[PDB]
């Protein structure tokens, strides 16, 4: 990774870690595949009003995958669950100035957001 913006998410890591998968207020998205070189785990913690109050991630993947998923984890904090649904792969790519060969990284990070939000939403129905 040659962009300052991308490398910063590795040299100055933020929100790397895990949340408690058993919580009714945590959603976990795990997307990608080791054989494809990119696996993103993104977890969100939602308060009882539906605001995301925290998030963590872990990513196996190139620098642009780490930055895309790290940025996604920052960006969901402070958003309602419905707001977080509108974060787009294109906004992440724009912020990180991703070249076209790394656009699949921003699309996987958007997938990770939605998988986490869907896991949370499935837990609230009962």
């Amino acid at each position: 990774a040659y962009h300052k913006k991308v490398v910063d998410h590795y040299e100055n890591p933020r929100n790397v870690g895990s949340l408690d998968k058993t919580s009714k207020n945590v959603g976990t998205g795990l997307v990608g595949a080791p054989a494809c070189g990119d696996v993103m785990k993104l977890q969100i913690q939602v308060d009882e009003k539906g605001k995301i109050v925290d998030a963590r991630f872990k990513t196996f993947g190139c620098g642009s995958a780490i930055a895309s998923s790290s940025l996604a984890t920052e960006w969901v904090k402070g958003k309602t669950v419905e707001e977080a649904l509108t974060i787009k792969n294109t906004d992440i790519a724009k912020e990180l100035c991703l070249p076209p060969v790394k656009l699949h990284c921003s699309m996987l990070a958007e997938d990770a957001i939605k998988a986490a939000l869907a896991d949370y939403k499935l837990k609230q129905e009962p």
């Binding site: 890591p13 790397v16 997307v31 595949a33 080791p34 993103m40 990513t59 196996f60």
Partner: peptide, 22 residues
């Protein structure tokens, strides 16, 4: 490795060859 979900899973004794990916 400390940032990697694959290392996290192996450290928790998960068989990566048992997961249904994508």
């Amino acid at each position: 490795r400390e940032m990697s979900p694959l290392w996290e899973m192996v450290q928790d004794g998960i068989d990566l060859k048992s997961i249904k990916w994508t």
